Curated annotation (Swiss-Prot), chain B:
Family: Belongs to the universal ribosomal protein uS19 family.
GO process annotations (BP): ribosomal small subunit assembly; translation
Gene from which this protein is expressed: rpsS
Organism, scientific name: Thermus thermophilus (strain ATCC 27634 / DSM 579 / HB8)
Entry keyword RNA-binding: yes
Free-text function comment from the UniProt entry: Located at the top of the head of the 30S subunit, extending towards the 50S subunit, which it may contact in the 70S complex. Contacts several RNA helices of the 16S rRNA.
Protein name: Small ribosomal subunit protein uS19
Source lineage: Bacteria, Thermotogati, Deinococcota, Deinococci, Thermales
UniProtKB/Swiss-Prot annotation, chain C:
Subunit relationships: Part of the 30S ribosomal subunit.
The entry's keywords: Ribonucleoprotein, Ribosomal protein, RNA-binding, rRNA-binding
Native source organism of the sequence: Thermus thermophilus (strain ATCC 27634 / DSM 579 / HB8)
Domain of life: Bacteria
Designated name of the protein: Small ribosomal subunit protein bTHX
Swiss-Prot record, chain D:
GO biological process, one term: translation
InterPro entries in the record: Rbsml_uS13_C (IPR027437), Ribosomal_uS13 (IPR001892), Ribosomal_uS13-like_H2TH (IPR010979), Ribosomal_uS13_bac-type (IPR019980), Ribosomal_uS13_CS (IPR018269)
Cited function: Located at the top of the head of the 30S subunit, it contacts several helices of the 16S rRNA. In the 70S ribosome structure it contacts the 23S rRNA (bridge B1a) and protein L5 of the 50S subunit (bridge B1b), connecting the top of the two subunits; these bridges are in contact with the A site and P site tRNAs respectively and are implicated in movement during ribosome translocation. Separately contacts the tRNAs in the A and P sites.
Gene responsible for this protein: rpsM
Name of the protein described by the UniProt record: Small ribosomal subunit protein uS13
Species of provenance: Thermus thermophilus (strain ATCC 27634 / DSM 579 / HB8)
Region (Disordered): 94-118
Organismal lineage: Bacteria, Thermotogati, Deinococcota, Deinococci, Thermales
Curated annotation (Swiss-Prot), chain E:
Organism of provenance: Thermus thermophilus (strain ATCC 27634 / DSM 579 / HB8)
Keywords tagged on the record: Metal-binding, Ribonucleoprotein, Ribosomal protein, RNA-binding, rRNA-binding, Zinc
Protein name per the record: Large ribosomal subunit protein bL31
InterPro entries: Ribosomal_bL28/bL31-like_sf (IPR034704), Ribosomal_bL31 (IPR002150), Ribosomal_bL31_A (IPR027491), Ribosomal_bL31_sf (IPR042105)
Cofactor comment: Binds 1 zinc ion per subunit.
One annotated GO biological process: translation
Any one GO cellular component localisation term in the record: ribosome
Gene3D superfamilies, A to Z: Ribosomal protein L31 (4.10.830.30)
GO MF annotations in UniProt: metal ion binding; rRNA binding; structural constituent of ribosome
Binding site for Zn(2+): C16, C18, C36, C39
Cofactor(s), names only, from the UniProt record: Zn(2+)
PANTHER family recorded: 50S RIBOSOMAL PROTEIN L31, CHLOROPLASTIC, LARGE RIBOSOMAL SUBUNIT PROTEIN BL31C
Length: 181, 81, 25, 118, 66
RNA sequence: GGCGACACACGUGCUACAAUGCCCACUACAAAGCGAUGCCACCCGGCAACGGGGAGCUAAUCGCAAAAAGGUGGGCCCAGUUCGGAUUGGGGUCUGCAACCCGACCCCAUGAAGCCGGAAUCGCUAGUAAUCGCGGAUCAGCCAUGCCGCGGUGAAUACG
RNA sequence: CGCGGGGUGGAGCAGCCCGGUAGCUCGUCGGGCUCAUAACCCGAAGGUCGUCGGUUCAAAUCCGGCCCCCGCAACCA
RNA sequence: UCGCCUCCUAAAAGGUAACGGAGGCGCCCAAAGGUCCCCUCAGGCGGGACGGAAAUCCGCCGGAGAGCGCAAGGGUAGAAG
């Protein structure tokens, strides 16, 4: 679907606010938002390669994409880890499917997080992308809670064309990202 | 606890109410650890007694409902080894 | 059991009275 | 279904299944049951999403609970320590706060025993 | 997207302490969300319900009347 | 102020680990002792501790008093749980010149170890052992689970 | 100098060979039995593997240097 | 100690001794082979639940210091990885 409420909210009322604030000679110079990369690192399923495809089934359900699997770069002794094995799932979502996911994340998921006095605002990476991570997977609407065998969280990479943190913050703020200020 | 109550020994309650309207305030040593503290105690430095000597205790506003002896410990420990 | 002061058994054992063993007859 | 925080109770009884929340039990349970006017002998398994929303919305709103409660008891203790007070030292050193006796069994608050020689 | 191997992702409706989020466009249409914060209970749309800090406040208050 | 200390070690005990059990309601049956510087019916306020009031008793003459287990009914459905209530947070009550060190009690929250205990080891031969409650001395109050007593129910087993 | 073996809880000895895991007796500590000690029983603690380097994902283990130990040898002159 | 490979000695062709200085081989791989197509390292800094010097993820910087089954050399990402 090409409609998707947040996409809109970005175009009508997020873009202009940004042009009003920083002020921009070019339509392109104003920050767009590409690539939410979701990544589950799991040493948890290492010797068990079965547990994994459940986690990928879970990730599919909330993303609408099947993740691909990442495999161990080098071999490390101290926690098991032959250089062969699967460490975790990683899904790239952009372009619509991205949007429909961030919407759900803003209006349902984070709200459901126990505590949550808001998203940490130091996680901006200095060139203006943002990262965060979640402890449990059941904070999502598509997860039924009786389909959790074991908790696994993840890492989320919000990538943005904004050259700086400040602008990147502004973009995401205006989209409705709740921040701990 | 008490309530119809809030007991404070008149010894220091004197010299404290005194150190409010004098305009000057300094170091005051009481044996009264049974008393309660504040509001006009705050900012003052009182030396409470543990049975052995008088220990200076700086008075701030979350020390409020507490007796003075709470900030002047009677025993000496530092563990066994 | 006799040590739960929040019950009839506790209160009796401790000899006391309250919401969990109110005095009536 | 789930009340404050996540805390899903289930099956069992309802007025019992309410204990399983941090901050609530016995009394506070039997209370919110007639102040939302719900049968306590009913089982959380089955009941109207109606009596479910009345129930969540009451509890979550009346008193503070798992997240903010824990953090509030947390903060009290922090205050007791670092103010320098005597209840504070016994939190600092992991020892019993209210009278009692440490020459012998404090175990609950001292840990397992750590034996030494004679 | 490679055809096979995939959740449908069809338009939905969805629920909360609030009304519906028409947005949806998710797998598995008709979902029920326990509560959100936005929809403005519980933090955003700051309610500050149940509110804390009372414990420095209290010790000074019932205190000096007695 | 300390005798109340706490890395630890021992003795005597209380409470348990549950369904011959826990909870709530209703409903029975004791004895011995204490009390007009005290015991306090009954009414009211309070969820309650308790606080107002306030009659009777120098006491087989009024009070402590409810005995508890039991009985009946209902609930819990084998779960670290309606088991178990240690710890801790907050809120109060009473005594007392005063409850920080060091009080007892009520309420809200918190709910720990514990699923019958290694080697070892104690008591008990009948109205006993188990188990259930009650009074008193000391005493302002109380760390009593102690002690000295009172009755309720009430086994097993001794070839030798 | 030369060739061969060794260095691991307090003591004595395995494990090294064949990379991943450090065990055995005794001592030590806490309980028990005894009037008491020993014997005896029930529990526990304790080693970074001489050392410095290297190899590997990983070194007590494989490799090199150095330091001690024990043994053998040092003949025709 | 004795055959074989790498480096130095070796005096800028080749070659060149010593009981000169240092290391390796006596295998291995049905994919670690042929071809076509694609992809590009290590490291550092910043961000990210369990994740720690390091598992996985995201950003920038990083002409090769990585990789090329094993020693060393030469070579090599305009690929041999
Ligand atoms: Mg930053
Ligand atoms: Mg950017
Ligand atoms: Mg109980
Ligand atoms: Mg004594
Ligand atoms: Mg003490
Ligand atoms: Mg006892
Ligand atoms: Mg356990
Ligand atoms: Mg005290
Ligand atoms: Mg059981
Ligand atoms: Mg026993
Ligand atoms: Mg007494
Ligand atoms: Mg008694
Ligand atoms: Mg011994
Ligand atoms: Mg002996
Ligand atoms: Mg060596
Ligand atoms: Mg190494
Ligand atoms: Mg000869
Ligand atoms: Mg000769
Ligand atoms: Mg000569
Ligand atoms: Mg060269
Ligand atoms: Mg040459
Ligand atoms: Mg030449
Ligand atoms: Mg030449
Ligand atoms: Mg050789
Ligand atoms: Mg890198
Ligand atoms: Mg980093
Ligand atoms: Mg190279
Ligand atoms: Mg080479
Ligand atoms: Mg090489
Ligand atoms: Mg080379």
């Amino acid at each position: 679907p090409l409609d998707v409420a947040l996409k809109r909210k970005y175009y009508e009322e997020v873009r202009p606010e940004l042009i009003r604030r920083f002020g921009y000679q070019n339509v392109w110079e104003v920050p767009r938002l590409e690539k939410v990369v979701i990544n589950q690192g799991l040493g948890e399923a290492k010797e068990d390669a079965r547990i994994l495809e459940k986690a990928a089934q879970e990730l599919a359900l909330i993303t609408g994409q099947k993740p691909a699997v990442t495999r161990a770069k080098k071999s490390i002794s101290n926690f098991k880890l032959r250089k062969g094995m699967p460490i975790g799932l990683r899904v790239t979502l952009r372009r619509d499917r991205m949007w429909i996911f961030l919407e759900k994340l803003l209006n349902v998921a984070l709200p459901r997080i126990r505590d949550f006095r808001g998203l940490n605002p130091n996680s901006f990476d200095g060139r203006g992308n943002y990262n965060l991570g979640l402890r449990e997977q059941l904070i999502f609407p598509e997860i039924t809670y009786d389909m959790v065998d074991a908790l696994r969280g993840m890492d989320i990479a919000v990538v943005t064309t904004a050259e700086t943190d400040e602008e990147a913050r502004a973009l995401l703020e205006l989209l409705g990202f709740p921040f701990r200020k | 606890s008490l309530k119809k109550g809030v007991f404070v020994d008149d010894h220091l309650l004197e010299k404290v109410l005194e150190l409010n309207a004098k305009g000057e305030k300094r170091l005051i040593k009481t044996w009264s650890r049974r008393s309660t503290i504040v509001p006009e105690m705050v900012g003052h430095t009182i030396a409470v007694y543990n049975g052995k000597q008088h220990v200076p205790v700086y008075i701030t506003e979350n020390m409020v409902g507490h007796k003075l002896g709470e900030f002047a410990p009677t025993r000496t420990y530092r563990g066994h080894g | 059991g006799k040590g739960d002061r929040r019950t009839r058994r506790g209160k009796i054992w401790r000899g006391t009275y309250g919401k969990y063993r109110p005095r009536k007859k | 279904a789930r009340i404050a925080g996540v805390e899903i109770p289930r099956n069992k009884r309802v007025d019992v299944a309410l204990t399983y929340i941090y901050g609530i039990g016995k009394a506070r349970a039997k209370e919110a049951l007639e102040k939302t006017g719900i049968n306590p002998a009913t089982r959380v398994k089955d009941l109207t999403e109606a009596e479910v929303v009345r129930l969540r919305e009451y509890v979550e709103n009346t008193w503070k609970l798992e997240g903010e409660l824990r953090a509030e008891v947390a903060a009290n203790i922090k205050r007791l320590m670092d103010i320098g007070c005597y209840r504070g030292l016994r939190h600092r050193r992991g020892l019993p706060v209210r009278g009692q006796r440490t020459r012998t069994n404090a175990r609950t608050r001292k840990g397992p025993r750590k034996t030494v020689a004679a | 997207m490679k055809e096979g191997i995939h959740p449908k992702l069809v338009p939905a409706r969805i629920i909360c302490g609030c009304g519906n989020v028409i947005e949806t466009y998710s797998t598995k249409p008709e979902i029920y969300v326990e509560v959100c914060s936005k929809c403005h209970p519980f933090y955003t749309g700051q309610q500050r319900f149940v509110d804390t800090e009372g414990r420095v406040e209290r010790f000074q208050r019932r205190y000096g009347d007695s």
